[PDB]
Amino acid sequence: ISFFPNKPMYHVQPHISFITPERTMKTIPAFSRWAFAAVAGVFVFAMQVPKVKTTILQPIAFIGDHFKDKTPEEDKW
Amino acid sequence: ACHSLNLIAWRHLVGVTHTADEAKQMASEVEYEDGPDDEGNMFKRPGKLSD
């Protein structure tokens, strides 16, 4: 009934090879941080695409001033 | 009258030495050829802002 009869405080747990639940519970913050870093990098590399500027960047206050078009009435033909 | 500058368009001047309305009005004076029409033929048209 028990893996170690002399010490019942030892239970085996479901696993595949070493993907036991405790290891994943320890791992989760690393995945969260890596995903956040990847998202930040992707956002950094696409901060000048016109669609991104006109959808996300400008509605943000304070910083929204910088990411505009300042050309007066003298503009595209 | 004698030299030619056939690499500077009218739209190259808006924002540098003229505005859009001034450039358009200045370019409307000159005349250009504008391709075939209906039964062939070669007609003339007033200038535009991309010539």
Curated annotation (Swiss-Prot), chain A:
Cell compartment(s), UniProt: Mitochondrion inner membrane
One Pfam family per UniProt: QCR10
Gene Ontology biological process: mitochondrial electron transport, ubiquinol to cytochrome c; proton transmembrane transport
GO cellular component, one term: mitochondrion
Primary residence: mitochondrion
Domain of life: Eukaryota
Recorded topology in the membrane: Single-pass membrane protein
Mitochondrial intermembrane topological domain: 47-77
Mitochondrial matrix side stretches: 1-22
The UniProt record lists the keyword Cytoplasm: no
Keywords: Electron transport, Membrane, Mitochondrion, Mitochondrion inner membrane, Respiratory chain, Transmembrane, Transmembrane helix, Transport
TM region(s), chain numbering: 23-46
Homology family: Belongs to the UQCR11/QCR10 family.
Function, as annotated: Component of the ubiquinol-cytochrome c oxidoreductase, a multisubunit transmembrane complex that is part of the mitochondrial electron transport chain which drives oxidative phosphorylation.
Record note on quaternary structure: Component of the ubiquinol-cytochrome c oxidoreductase (cytochrome b-c1 complex, complex III, CIII), a multisubunit enzyme composed of 3 respiratory subunits cytochrome b, cytochrome c1 and Rieske protein, 2 core protein subunits, and additional low-molecular weight protein subunits. The complex exists as an obligatory dimer and forms supercomplexes (SCs) in the inner mitochondrial membrane with cytochrome c oxidase (complex IV, CIV).
Name this polypeptide is given: Cytochrome b-c1 complex subunit 10
Curated annotation (Swiss-Prot), chain B:
Binding site for heme c: C2, H3
Cell location: Mitochondrion inner membrane
Assembly and binders: Component of the ubiquinol-cytochrome c oxidoreductase (cytochrome b-c1 complex, complex III, CIII), a multisubunit enzyme composed of 3 respiratory subunits cytochrome b, cytochrome c1 and Rieske protein, 2 core protein subunits, and additional low-molecular weight protein subunits. The complex exists as an obligatory dimer and forms supercomplexes (SCs) in the inner mitochondrial membrane with cytochrome c oxidase (complex IV, CIV).
Known function: Component of the ubiquinol-cytochrome c oxidoreductase, a multisubunit transmembrane complex that is part of the mitochondrial electron transport chain which drives oxidative phosphorylation.
Family, as annotated: Belongs to the cytochrome c family.
Name used for this protein in its record: Cytochrome c1, heme protein, mitochondrial
Lineage, opening ranks: Eukaryota, Fungi, Dikarya, Ascomycota, Taphrinomycotina
The encoding gene: cyt1
